[PDB]
Amino acid sequence: INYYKDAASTSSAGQSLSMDPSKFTEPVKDLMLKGAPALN
């Protein structure tokens, strides 16, 4: 129950439960498959 009118006044947000490290761990242009050779 929100007792207040504005959105800033609500409690903390709830877990992204998004999670996708590939923008950080695999930003390569041509896709690399694990097990296939790195450099062909």
Partner 1 sequence: GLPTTTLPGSGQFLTTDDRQSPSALPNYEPTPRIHIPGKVHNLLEIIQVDTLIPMNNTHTKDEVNSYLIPLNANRQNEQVFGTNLFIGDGVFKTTLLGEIVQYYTHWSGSLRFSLMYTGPALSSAKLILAYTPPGARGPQDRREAMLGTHVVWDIGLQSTIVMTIPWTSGVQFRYTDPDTYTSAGFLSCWYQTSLILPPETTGQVYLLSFISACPDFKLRLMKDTQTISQTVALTE
Partner 2 sequence: TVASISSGPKHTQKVPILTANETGATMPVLPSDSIETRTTYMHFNGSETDVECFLGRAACVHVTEIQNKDATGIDNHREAKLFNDWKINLSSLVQLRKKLELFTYVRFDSEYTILATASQPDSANYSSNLVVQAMYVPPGAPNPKEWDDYTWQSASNPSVFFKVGDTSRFSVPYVGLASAYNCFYDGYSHDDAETQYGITVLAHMGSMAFRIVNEHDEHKTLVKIRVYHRAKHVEAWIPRAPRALPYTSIGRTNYPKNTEPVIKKRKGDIKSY
Partner 3 sequence: GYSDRVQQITLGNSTITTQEAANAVVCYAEWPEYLPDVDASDVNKTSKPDTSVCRFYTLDSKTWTTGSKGWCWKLPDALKDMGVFGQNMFFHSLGRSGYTVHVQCNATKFHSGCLLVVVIPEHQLASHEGGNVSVKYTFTHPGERGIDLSSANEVGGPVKDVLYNMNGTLLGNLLIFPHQFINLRTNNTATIVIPYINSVPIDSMTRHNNVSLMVIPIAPLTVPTGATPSLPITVTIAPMCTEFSGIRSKSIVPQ
x/- track of binding to partner 1 for residues 6-35 (CB under 8 A): x-xxxxx--xx-xxxx-xxx----------
- Residue ranges of the alpha helices (H) in the chain? 22-25
From residue 13 to residue 32, the character string flagging contacts with partner 2 as x (rule: CB under 8 A) and all else as - is: xxxxx-x----xxxxx---x
Measured over the CA atoms of residue 10, residue 11, residue 14 and residue 19, the dihedral's sign is positive
For partner 3, the binding residues in 6-25 under the rule CB under 8 A are: 22-24
Residue 24: φ, ψ to 5°: -95, -40
Binding residues for partner 3, rule: CB under 8 A, are 22-24, 26-30, 32, 38-40
